[PDB]
Design a binder for this molecule. Structure first.
Ligand SMILES: O=C(O)[C@@](O)(COP(=O)(O)O)[C@H](O)[C@H](O)COP(=O)(O)O
Ligand SMILES: O=C(O)[C@@](O)(COP(=O)(O)O)[C@H](O)[C@H](O)COP(=O)(O)O
Ligand SMILES: [Mg+2]
Ligand SMILES: [Mg+2]
Lengths: 468, 140, 467, 140
């Protein structure tokens, strides 16, 4: 007699949570953790602790497990692989049953998978490298308001990357001066301009004043050029009530696009905003402010690819992807990898690009990657070669830094982009002939020539921290 | 410092900031279409319907966001499904421009996988148009 | 003529490094542990951080001339060397109050930690502390109630509060949840709570849980004669769902709800804190995801900053770590940020990681919550570390008791009161802790049983988050 | 395993889970209050007003959150502001309990800096009370 019963006390997590013979189900959410155990702690126990404390278990045995089926709900570390070149680093794979997650809530998914495990004394460092979001869970999300194809169709823009630009100085400009700068930028050839991520509503410029003046600038530049124009008006705010008041104002003004800092504003607020944008036809540009606080280091945190998948799920028409060649870090291979994860419907596992799991988006709209930060005309060939047409390239300083002003600065970037696009379409190799394409364009474009002169020797080349 | 002129300087999206495309450069863009297996198609519109406008918004409540008239142009015949001959595309450009000599005409191409237009540029503007500037007069 | 516009790039230090600047009492101050790339002077790196977190970009823009950079620019006014490191520095930056949106933690973070952590010019960056001036503190509603008001509403004084996270984390039905809650509360615990990841799932939908928990709360309260509560989780995928859950709690007349402020977000959290203030609900804040940001010494944001941010956004409780439990929490650092979340005025004290003197200008204090891998033998140390103004939670430490939840709760309540009594009598918990507990075991079978099960359990590892 | 009885096992907050406090243990708590400069005060209540209730909520809309009747008790005289003598407190405990022999009586202390009660425990329970259990009968 007497089957398995309740026995009070502590036992190793691995006895219940390390299951190397488990066969993952196609509806399971999978996680790849770069784990660094404390000395003396078995990798198996470390991985098991991670799986346990991010799913169903705690530090000691509880009798309540008997009322339900732990086999059905427990998270499982089903595989542990040593990291090459690392003596104390391992990739622990954990499978989570789909029942553990609230439908359509990125907030809930993160709460479980990265909620408490990163602070366990038993480990010295932990980094979430990737997540396999199964189609069954992907379908529970509304997803992006529109997506790449729909965005292009609403803007009526095709055949080249889109061009953006962050107004500068970051802070300090009045509402009218903002609109003035915006108008001059847009009329020169840029498709968009935008509020800097930290421009919300402040003493030097209240938001509604900015929204109104920007609307005038948008419509003036559009009437003047004959091309649809937009400016991402920032809805990021201290409370959801304020965030919505800003989105509502944009709706009432008839403008095309707004923006939101999804990480500093938060997933709960972002999902609500994305849903509002879907229901009111507003394009939603997402700024990844604060992401580097979490995704810069190779040994601890969450890799950006996971933060990108999370945003795609929460909702966003645009998402900054880095530039590779700009002022902010972004290793090429890693970048090409999460760009595919952001835009494509199906991405197969590819470790050479940090893609730990094959990702099936099951028709969820693709997100437009936005390359922005410290880039100028000479970077155009590389940018087009790296991203292709489906991306928005932004030049803030690269536009308002032009010696002749915003309009000429805008024209120089638009010319560089079209010159490179034309060259590629003609079969020219941008990786090798880029410089010649730009120099040729300079002969008939004094605007571009002036830009090329000012930034010719400017490059950003440093040792990469976020290496595979 | 040269000043970008705001007067009669209308643009037409992709490639409108480059010098006017020569027949050779146009043919090259067509080869690009065929080489990628995309679907060529011509579209046209009379001057009054060439640029986006807000006329219909007069019938709207607060829902004009991303709605503009004149984005849709008129289709010349049908998309050239299965076209693998650039000469074929060039002949339709000649036929279309001949039938509508005073209309705006643009060449586009569709991708049925992503289901979206993947390229496009203007191939004709009425000779009567006085709202645009030649490359060397966009700035003064 | 005078100063004009000159296109082109120039060092950030020429405009953003101001070593003689005298900080104003309304400036927001930041202390950055900065690790520059080789070849990049510390002052230039510090200047870049100040510039790109305030008003500047990578090249000269003519628009600076339309406004006054002297008035708006962030300033790196001091660079301090780090002992034991020859490539790590503490860079101090002053931000004028005009740069921030009133009452918005989201905006404050967007500027100070928005883009600078990803710059190629630096190898690592960590925000160690922030000096929030009274003038900016006053723009926030702050916590719904605060320590004093919370105690007054619960009518509980003279001892730390006792909580408990229901387990297993996920997998329990709504009725079984209420079953475990009633048994926990009736044994002496003041609170129980939804695990941070318990929101609404197939195995248990939120409204079903809220209802059964309400029955359990009221049954336990009637049985014991002491006010009871259970933090019902309002954390959701959208603000609409979050509010629906807060509204249900209001309608059921229950005392408290909880929110995961980092995974839910500051925007959502602030809205909820405001709702709780206007509706009389206590708000427990769980810090899920904080270790992803605050664990490493070289990069990220220290928890003390995340705590100040929460106090501003609003929260009646906030987990503070246990020091002695399963999760990391260095003693000195912990004592430091506990004061920062509870007190009105905290003097600079680098020995405790306090880089700036902080004046909260009467904003309510936040109740620290020590939770995670703790049991009865830890009681002496917990009471000695936190004092009465804290909530000590025992999840596995209650539902892991050999006789069940009620006995488990009784053991913790007994251990807490025995230690509280001892301290008040003048006994040194640090030295006599064990004796106090052993004495209580003589007349408390529940405590004795708990003591026997976890006697050999301790969590002692090398600390990663060191000063 | 012993079972915690749910019948007639009412508690009274701080220290009610320890064995009944002895005069010495009570005096020790009083020394603690005086030594820390806190303000001692006595409060009392008849049996029907001893434990929290919801009676008044019948007059409420949806605002019962954290509202309970019987949290407030009746003050005995006034708080002993400036008291630095533990003996004065013990004297009042005697006076209060003698005046209201059939009421519940609790000793509390106030901190005027944090402005909140910093201590409290029962010092008298009516003899007729049958809703509580002795330390050894709390579990069976
Ligand atoms: O604040 C800034 O620096 C920018 O406006 C760019 O200005 P410039 O165009 O003048 O450089 C962008 O927000 C960054 O590109 C964000 O970084 P990322 O794209 O990596 O998220
Ligand atoms: O999920 C858990 O592990 C807990 O419910 C504790 O369970 P036990 O009581 O069974 O350990 C708490 O959320 C942690 O205390 C959070 O960590 P911290 O307080 O550091 O934020
Ligand atoms: Mg920016
Ligand atoms: Mg928990």
């Amino acid at each position: 007699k007497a089957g398995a019963g309740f026995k009070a006390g502590v036992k190793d997590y691995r006895l219940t949570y390390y299951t190397p013979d488990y066969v993952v189900r196609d509806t399971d959410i999978l996680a790849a953790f770069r784990m660094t155990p404390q000395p003396g702690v078995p990798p198996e126990e470390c991985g098991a602790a991670v799986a346990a404390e991010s799913s169903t278990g705690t530090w000691t045995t509880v009798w309540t497990d008997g009322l339900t089926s732990l086999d059905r709900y427990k998270g499982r570390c089903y595989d542990i692989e040593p990291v090459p070149g690392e003596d104390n680093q391992y990739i622990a794979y954990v499978a989570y049953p789909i029942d553990l997650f609230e439908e359509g809530s990125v907030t809930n998914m993160f709460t479980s998978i990265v909620g408490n495990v990163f602070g366990f004394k038993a480990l010295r460092a932990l980094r979430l490298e990737d997540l396999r979001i199964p189609p069954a869970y992907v379908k529970t999300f509304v997803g992006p308001p529109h997506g790449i194809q729909v965005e292009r169709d609403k803007l009526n823009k095709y055949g080249r990357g889109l061009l953006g630009c962050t107004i500068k100085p970051k802070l300090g400009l009045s509402a009218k001066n903002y609109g003035r700068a915006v108008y001059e930028c847009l009329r020169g050839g840029l498709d968009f301009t935008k509020d800097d991520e930290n421009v919300n509503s402040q003493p030097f410029m209240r938001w509604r004043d900015r929204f109104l003046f920007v609307a005038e600038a948008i419509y003036k530049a559009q009437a003047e050029t004959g091309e649809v124009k937009g400016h991402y008006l920032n809805a990021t705010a201290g409370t959801c009530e304020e965030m919505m008041k800003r989105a509502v104002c944009a709706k009432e003004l008839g403008v095309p696009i707004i923006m939101h800092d999804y990480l500093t504003g938060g997933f709960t607020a972002n999902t609500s905003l994305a849903i509002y944008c879907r229901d009111n036809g507003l394009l939603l540009h997402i700024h990844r402010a604060m992401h580097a606080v979490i995704d810069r280091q190779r040994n601890h945190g969450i890799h950006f690819r996971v933060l990108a998948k999370a945003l795609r799920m929460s909702g966003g028409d645009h998402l900054h992807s880095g530039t590779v060649v700009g002022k902010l870090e972004g290793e090429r291979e890693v970048t090409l990898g999460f760009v595919d994860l952001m835009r494509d419907d199906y991405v197969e596992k590819d470790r050479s690009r940090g893609i730990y799991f094959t990702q099936d988006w099951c028709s969820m709209p693709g997100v437009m990657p936005v390359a922005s930060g410290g880039i100028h005309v000479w970077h155009m060939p590389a940018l087009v070669e790296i991203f292709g047409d489906d991306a928005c390239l932004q030049f803030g300083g690269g536009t308002l830094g032009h010696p002749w002003g915003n309009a000429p600065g805008a024209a120089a970037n638009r010319v560089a982009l079209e010159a490179c696009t034309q060259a590629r379409n003609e079969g020219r190799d941008l990786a090798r002939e880029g410089g010649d394409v730009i120099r040729s364009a300079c002969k008939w474009s004094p605007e571009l020539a002036a830009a090329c002169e000012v930034w010719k020797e400017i490059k950003f080349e440093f040792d990469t921290i976020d290496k595979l | 410092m040269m000043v970008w002129t705001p007067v009669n300087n209308k643009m037409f999206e992709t490639f409108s900031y480059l010098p006017p495309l020569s027949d050779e450069q146009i043919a090259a863009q067509v080869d690009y279409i065929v080489a990628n297996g995309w679907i060529p198609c011509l579209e046209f519109a009379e001057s009054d319907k060439a640029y986006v406008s807000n006329e219909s918004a007069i019938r709207f409540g607060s829902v004009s966001c991303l709605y503009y008239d004149n984005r849709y142009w008129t289709m010349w015949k049908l998309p050239m499904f299965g076209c693998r001959d650039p000469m074929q595309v060039l002949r339709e450009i000649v036929a279309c421009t001949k039938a509508f000599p005073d209309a705006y005409v643009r060449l586009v191409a569709f991708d049925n996988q992503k289901q979206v237009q993947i390229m496009g540029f203007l191939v004709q503007r009425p000779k009567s148009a006085r709202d645009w500037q030649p490359a060397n007069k966009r700035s003064v």
